[model samples]
Target: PPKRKIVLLMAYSGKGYHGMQRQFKTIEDDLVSALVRSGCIPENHGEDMRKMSFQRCARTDKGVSAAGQVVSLKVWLIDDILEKINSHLPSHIRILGLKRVTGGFNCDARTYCYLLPTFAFAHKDRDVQDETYRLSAETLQQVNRLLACYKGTHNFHNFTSQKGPQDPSACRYILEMYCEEPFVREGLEFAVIRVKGQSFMMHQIRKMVGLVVAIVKGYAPESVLERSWGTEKVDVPKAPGLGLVLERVHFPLDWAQEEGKVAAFKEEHIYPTIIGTERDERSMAQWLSTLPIHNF
Candidate 1:
């Protein structure tokens, strides 16, 4: 029999972990190690792992979490693999589902998609420091109107820190942008902020979120999107990494497989608490955004 590959989609909280998709010394790293320990990795999937390493669809920061994370790997099938690991996984980490894919399927090289501009809002009263994150009616309205301005294609270079100017096609095509609300019995109520785009350059999501924030705060004018279309780059504020998730990765239809081709991807982070490059700490910049500095 031939070996097969799988794509795992996960929902993880970044609060008590070493960031998403850890390197050698992170929960991300340990989870990979655990895979080998469980016999999922049949052969030599090792050596210079950070490079020939398991490619992360995205690099989420220390304090963030994702309900839609994707990872693809080639491995041998085992009975009750996900069940066994979930039993051993630490409290904060849980294996959502396992999806097996064909040996040749690449998480990349395929057009993957997910909800975008995920709506995140909190009641800003200039008093609550550790504000509870939830959806707001005012903010939700802003997101709907604002998304209309940003949906069409334009040169968004000023809004994103895209590491390249050579690669053309920064011109992205938006499929859909809508607001939503999750149904959790006793969970925190949050307003939905979704975006459907063929591709997003770096900081694009954060930038869009900022535009929403701007609208709520009265900075982004109704017709300002067209006004700012060709405007030069200015001080672009990045929403905190804590509130965002990779959301989902869209893939091309031709990549689907039947056998090991598609099964739930499971993960159990050995440890929680992400160790940022210098011990993740709240910064003055992030503070300023969430708080008011005006003399009262």
Candidate 2:
């Protein structure tokens, strides 16, 4: 039979593992090993999985969680490929689903969540409110306003460590950035900062989240964001990866429409289920628990 080229919707807690970059004990290593054990693909040796044309939509790092990470590869499969893959994997990891996409199925926009205790955004000084995992409505409003500045394109050189101020590729785009209402669990309140973008450079989302948190806490001036666009550089904080989650990856029709290129996978067909999985609290909590940071 002809080999199957499929996209795997994967989820994992980055706890006890290094970042997605090349490392001895990496997510890709364990995942590829499991795929091979599942009889989905042949054993890959020395050259790294890239020789097999394996491509991941997002390369999340240590202590991060991904509710909707994606990868595309060719494989031989049994009738139930999903179950087989999961059977070979551990409890903290899951195969959300698999889809047969066009040969050009490059992922479009990716959405991520940075979950922090509401207290992280608490004012530097206030009435006896302890550093509980909570955020006040007033504080959330301020953070939202600060996040508004990053909505469109800007020089994000201060955000990621990859390129200097002059790399044209350094100019990334953010389609949406905002936070959700506070949700209480175990007497601790937490909020999620969701960021959707075409793509991100290394550590960019965490750095962005860190800067916004700093602005709300009064540690950094709001003007720092505006000045980030100027030639001069300013120090920006980076939120811990523990609070970050790859919420979802997008490949919508508008991307092709706006960019004037055809997309590899039709958004209508592949996205509906993946989005639902990412939104399910029970599902996310299960995978999320593997990280120690979520614990109070």
Candidate 3:
């Protein structure tokens, strides 16, 4: 059978898995197993699977979750394939939307939201110099200001593991970064730091959060982020993955949404499917809270 390229919009709570990548035990392992078993694609080394050419938009750490994760691959156009694939997946993982796109239509960017407790910035190791665990408006301002420093392209080698000074790939771009207003749940205050970027190296998002909180708490100088651009390594810690959620993946619509053959894809398929999934909230909370891990 001739294979067709397809992109799947999916979500998963990373609680039980090591991470999103193919590790000792992980979401990717389970997903690939399901894809093969459900007959959506053959084995990775097998003939049919090779034509599918699988790739992911982003990778998340253990305890992280995705609301709009995307995966692209080629596969046989089996009847009701979505339903069949979902049946093979565990309850926490769900395929939200699927689209058939022309070659080169890779995901362009990813938005991640890291929900943190208000007290997360109050570590004893931090120099907060005697402040309440509850972040005051003034302190929040500092946090947002620090977050803004990450707006443009920079050498983010300190944010992740093992990218040396000379690695051109260490220079990464940040489109935006901001912290959301605090909300109280279970009598505990929480806030979200949202970041949209071209891509991230391993542990990059988590460590970035850690550095920002450290600065906000006076553990690190506010200038710490600016200094991170240098070749000398700054040891940034990784925040707990529990609160990170993959918000969405962006694609270049101009190229992907052409006037004729691609026009049908954008107007009739991609936009509607993604918009529909964005409105879904029923499973959102349950997925986050299941097997919850709250402290860093």
Q: Could you say which candidate leads in TM-score?
A: 2
**lDDT-based ranking:** 3, 2, 1
lDDT of 1 by residue, 83-119 (tens): 6655655555555667776556652211221222222
lDDT of 3 by residue, 65-131 (tens): 7767788887776878888888888876777667777877656588888766666555445424221
How many clashes (backbone N, Cα, C below 3 Å) per candidate? 28, 3, 1
The top-ranked prediction according to lDDT is: 3
Model 3 clash pairs?
Answer: 52-74
lDDT of each residue in 149-260, candidate 2, tens digit only: 8999988877777443544336789988899998765565667788898768777887788777666766667887887777666566666666677767776222223221
Candidate 3 accuracy as TM-score: 0.72
Where is model 1 more than 4 Å wrong at Cα?
22-27, 42-53, 107-139, 162-169, 181-189, 252-296
Better of 2 and 3 by lDDT: 3
lDDT of 2 at 85: 86
C-alpha lDDT of candidate 1 relative to the true structure: 0.50
